[PDB]
């Protein structure tokens, strides 16, 4: 009968009202639409790009809004069902922000040099009975040589769903929920951290509410 605290959110669409945390104006002022140049583009990001202004590409914010809805819904549902959400980035200007965001929530953050086999040779590297993360959220999909991160391939190899902010120079290919958006501006990255932190915290408090209600019932 606990299949009502693990099946109910899954028939309510937007069970966590995550649709009231972001608007195409909030994103526009966070400067999410600003992308890279036509010379740093990706063929697979071409379907998400509104167009090019002065050889500087811009991302379609309606598509960003729909993708961000789906992403934040998924993140809220995994945080409710008590997964492990690992936030991965290689920025160096936002490492402090991502680790502090994980610690203000209760999820985890890899912001440092990804050692080979972290998710793949995981039992040998950590211990025989380790729980690998049930959702990896990349705030920046590229590494510091401007190439896709090992984790995006190894998360897929290990069948861990991935939510990721894909900019113009990124490969939205092996990312389950791509969110077309700027990740080079402090306001944009701050808004992403704020949105994901709020989703995860609201999800965990709602999980506690339904467990309390069913325990009293």
């Amino acid at each position: 009968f606990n299949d009502k605290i693990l099946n109910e959110p899954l028939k309510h669409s937007d069970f966590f009202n995550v649709k009231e945390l972001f608007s195409v104006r909030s994103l526009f002022d966070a400067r999410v639409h600003l992308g890279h140049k036509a010379g740093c583009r990706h063929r697979f990001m071409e379907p998400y790009i509104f167009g090019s202004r002065l050889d500087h590409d811009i991302i379609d914010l309606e598509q960003t809004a729909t993708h961000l809805q789906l992403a934040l819904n998924f993140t809220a549902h995994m945080a409710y069902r008590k997964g492990i959400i690992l936030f991965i980035s290689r920025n160096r200007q936002f490492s402090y922000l991502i680790e502090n965001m994980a610690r203000d929530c209760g999820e985890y953050a890899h912001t440092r040099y990804f050692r080979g086999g972290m998710l793949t040779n995981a039992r040998l590297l950590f211990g025989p009975t380790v729980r690998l993360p049930d959702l990896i959220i990349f705030l920046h999909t590229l590494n510091n040589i401007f190439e896709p991160h090992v984790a995006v391939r190894d998360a897929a190899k290990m069948n861990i769903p991935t939510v990721g902010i894909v900019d113009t120079n990124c490969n939205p290919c092996l990312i389950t929920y791509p969110v077309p958006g700027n990740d080079d501006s402090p306001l944009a990255v701050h808004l992403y951290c704020r949105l994901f932190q709020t989703a995860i915290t609201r999800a965990k408090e709602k999980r506690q509410q339904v467990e309390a209600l069913y325990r009293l019932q």
Binding site: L70, D134, L174, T176
Partner: protein, 126 residues
Amino acid sequence: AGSRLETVGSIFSRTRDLVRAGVLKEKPLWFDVYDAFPPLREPVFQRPRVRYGKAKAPIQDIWYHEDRIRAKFYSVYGSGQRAFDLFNPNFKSTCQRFVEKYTELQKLGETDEEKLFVETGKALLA
């Protein structure tokens, strides 16, 4: 077990096929969330490729009508000492003043561009 073939399909397709066969006995935590709210595109591997012949990107260049006059303004009356702010929404630069006044007269009813330009030039001079 699991399928570490990241290239054949998606994590959803691989996991669904393996739990149908009966080798993944427990379903993962994320499978029902995927089956409830799937993404707009299943994450299947696609190899990037270089366009070679007469293949061009579908991305267009953003050009509005005001830019015909914007380009003309900078040409004659260059960028003034009134500097752009950019940090504040609703910033109305001097060139924006010019295009708004010019577009005003246009709506009112004028015809040749040079006459339009001199009239809005005296208008901003006032």
